[PDB]
Write a protein that binds this ligand. Structure first.
Ligand SMILES: O=c1ccn([C@@H]2O[C@H](COP(=O)(O)OP(=O)(O)O[C@H]3O[C@H](CO)[C@H](O)[C@H](O)[C@H]3O)[C@@H](O)[C@H]2O)c(=O)[nH]1
Ligand SMILES: O=c1ccn([C@@H]2O[C@H](COP(=O)(O)OP(=O)(O)O[C@H]3O[C@H](CO)[C@H](O)[C@H](O)[C@H]3O)[C@@H](O)[C@H]2O)c(=O)[nH]1
Ligand SMILES: [Fe+3]
Ligand SMILES: [Fe+3]
Ligand SMILES: [K+]
Ligand SMILES: [K+]
Ligand SMILES: [Zn+2]
Ligand SMILES: [Zn+2]
Lengths: 347, 344
């Protein structure tokens, strides 16, 4: 038989992590008698008097939020890391070893509007968010080699607070992902003479099967090696080391691409579409970071619909990630919808 | 100041995978206004006339299940892998490349009792289950180097059917987990001249702080580098390459261990505790595998209660896993309950 990626299971390589992805084209034809997701509520207030994240409201700790009108950043009340944690007793023990961990955690409210998600925000507003991401990265980076910007959107994605926003966690070390991506890029670079993702963006621009968003300065695709159903990879077209390096143009442009990508996401099932996303850029380790290329990852769980998600368990935990749909199928369905939030379009 | 693992964040190494785990011991004190789980129904019938897995029932494909006793294994009606899949196009491209993927997938019904989960089954029954895992393993190992026994239990664990059971998927390659565990274990052995998990086992024996279940032949602990809140690692005290290598005693003993471990898990929150579990053993690759050590992993999502789970998202996806309680605190919680099923 002729090999048919659409019907034939195969494995794809993720050069960023060095891991394989199992693709099993028809897996989703099976009966689904499992959990049924709960789609988001259609009626929220712009201000929730009981929301710890709302403006002019008191946090769980009694501390009062300012009367913020834009973005708002504050040290997380339950930080995951601290700047002064004492050093751990480090050994060379090949069985049980530990290491120190310092840093901080900040929370960012995208806006005071309790009911407005990224896709529903102005490009201006979005531009503010980027500026904030930048401001945060630069300050923190002055102190920690790894600054991780991220966001958890929706209950299916473990958010513990319903207010629109993200987080930043700084680390004194290079976390798993960062060390891996760092090393792999560096090796590619040393070998190929060019940045791995810079070349990748080129190939994708020329192909288009996996393209979901394209703007002047940005490209969002369902990466070849994507793991989650509708996972996307957001990259600048030009070579950029960190978020702090973007020009104001690439910056306002980013806002636009974000609006587009998130709008498509919500348009996919005509509902708030949950996910975990975050930025990866060169570490502030004072080294040669030429091999780096700034990028954002979007890991959403929804699969068959608004109430049917993908579960990365069982074989996927004990062996390897296994996808039901191809990256090409995913991109296609994403290209199919409008890039204007249904709420904004009125359609 | 003086470091205190229960007060100070730090990172622990997973030598099986070469990955680090971020420990942040006070994280679960933050308010939780997120999702609430829905705990498994306590009352179900022994036979469901609409269940695809029940004895004598007709599957989705019209195929009819026999009036089986004990376990029942069948080829998955929607197998993720096939024996004859055409080879893929092999390239060495540094950006976009693929590889062939062959194998099979089987479904294992633990027993005819649609209502009896693992901890609720007799040791005898549990033994039959182990015999089947063995049979399957030896069978499939004849053709595939990688045999994956596993189980998805509970809606929270993306199980797609309620009947009690698991799955066995075989592969023509070594999946990610398998390749790294093989490599790291091999490297350790070359250096220590002893199997990594075998030594591990001893070290835990001489500690007990992470111990959760211990029988004559088995040991179950919350591994030092555990990821999931109440994650356990279940392994034989003696060097065993694969599940098919177990002695009859070791096997009957595994059934016991299992019952004990699972009863403890259900007793933790007094509910059917969800998880994904699976066995890791030597591959059937004709190679020198003395560095291997059979072992089972249990990855349960529950954290705060029967309605509040742990979500491995955000920072955890983008950087590294972050635990809210230490392995020691977890193990302690597990030990505190009876190993007798609250409703046995
Ligand atoms: O008065 C308050 C109320 C809440 N918070 C903080 O607001 C945050 C809300 O952020 P998220 O909704 O993104 O999620 P959490 O940080 O609560 O937890 C989630 O994100 C983590 C980081 O990725 C882990 O993955 C975790 O398992 C997952 O549930 C929490 O950190 C909480 O500590 C405050 O600082 N003050
Ligand atoms: O008539 C039927 C009905 C069902 N099945 C099979 O019975 C299995 C039920 O097994 P599980 O409940 O453990 O879960 P699934 O295999 O359906 O899927 C889960 O397990 C997979 C392997 O871990 C993936 O991780 C997937 O994302 C996850 O949701 C399914 O594979 C289904 O194909 C049949 O063979 N015949
Ligand atoms: Fe990355
Ligand atoms: Fe293992
Ligand atoms: K959020
Ligand atoms: K099951
Ligand atoms: Zn609010
Ligand atoms: Zn049944």
């Amino acid at each position: 038989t002729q090999f048919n990626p659409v019907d034939h299971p195969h494995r794809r390589y993720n050069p960023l992590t060095g891991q394989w992805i199992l693709v099993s084209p028809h897996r989703a034809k099976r009966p689904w008698q499992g959990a049924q997701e709960t789609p988001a509520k259609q009626v929220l207030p712009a201000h929730d008097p009981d929301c710890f994240l709302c403006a002019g409201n008191v946090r769980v700790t009694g501390d009062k939020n300012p009367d913020y009108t834009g973005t708002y950043v504050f040290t997380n009340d339950f930080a995951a890391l601290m700047s002064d944690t004492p050093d751990a007793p480090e050994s060379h023990d090949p069985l049980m070893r530990c290491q120190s961990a310092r840093g901080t955690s900040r929370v960012i409210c995208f806006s005071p509007d309790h009911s407005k998600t990224l896709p529903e925000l102005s490009v201006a507003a979005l531009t503010e968010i980027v500026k904030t991401w930048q401001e945060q990265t630069a300050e923190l980076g002055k102190t920690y080699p790894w600054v991780q910007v991220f966001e958890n959107k929706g209950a299916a994605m473990g958010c513990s607070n319903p207010h629109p926003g993200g987080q930043i966690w700084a680390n004194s070390f290079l976390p798993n992902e960062a060390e891996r991506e760092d090393r792999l890029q560096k090796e590619y670079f040393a070998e190929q003479k060019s940045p791995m993702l810079v070349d990748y963006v080129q190939r994708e621009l020329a192909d288009g099967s996996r393209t979901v968003v394209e703007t002047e300065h940005w490209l969002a695709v369902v990466p070849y090696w994507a793991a989650w159903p509708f996972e996307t990879l957001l990259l600048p077209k030009a070579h950029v080391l960190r978020i702090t390096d973007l020009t104001d143009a690439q910056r306002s442009d980013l806002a636009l691409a974000l609006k587009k990508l998130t709008s498509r996401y919500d348009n996919l099932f005509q509902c708030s579409f949950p996910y975990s996303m975050g930025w990866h850029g060169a570490p502030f380790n004072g080294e040669e970071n030429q091999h780096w290329q700034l990028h954002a990852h979007f890991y959403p769980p929804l699969l068959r619909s608004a109430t049917v998600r993908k579960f990365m368990v069982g074989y996927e935990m004990l062996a390897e990630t296994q996808r039901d749909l191809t990256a090409e199928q995913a991109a296609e369905r994403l290209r199919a919808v409008s890039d204007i939030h249904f709420r904004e379009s009125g359609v």
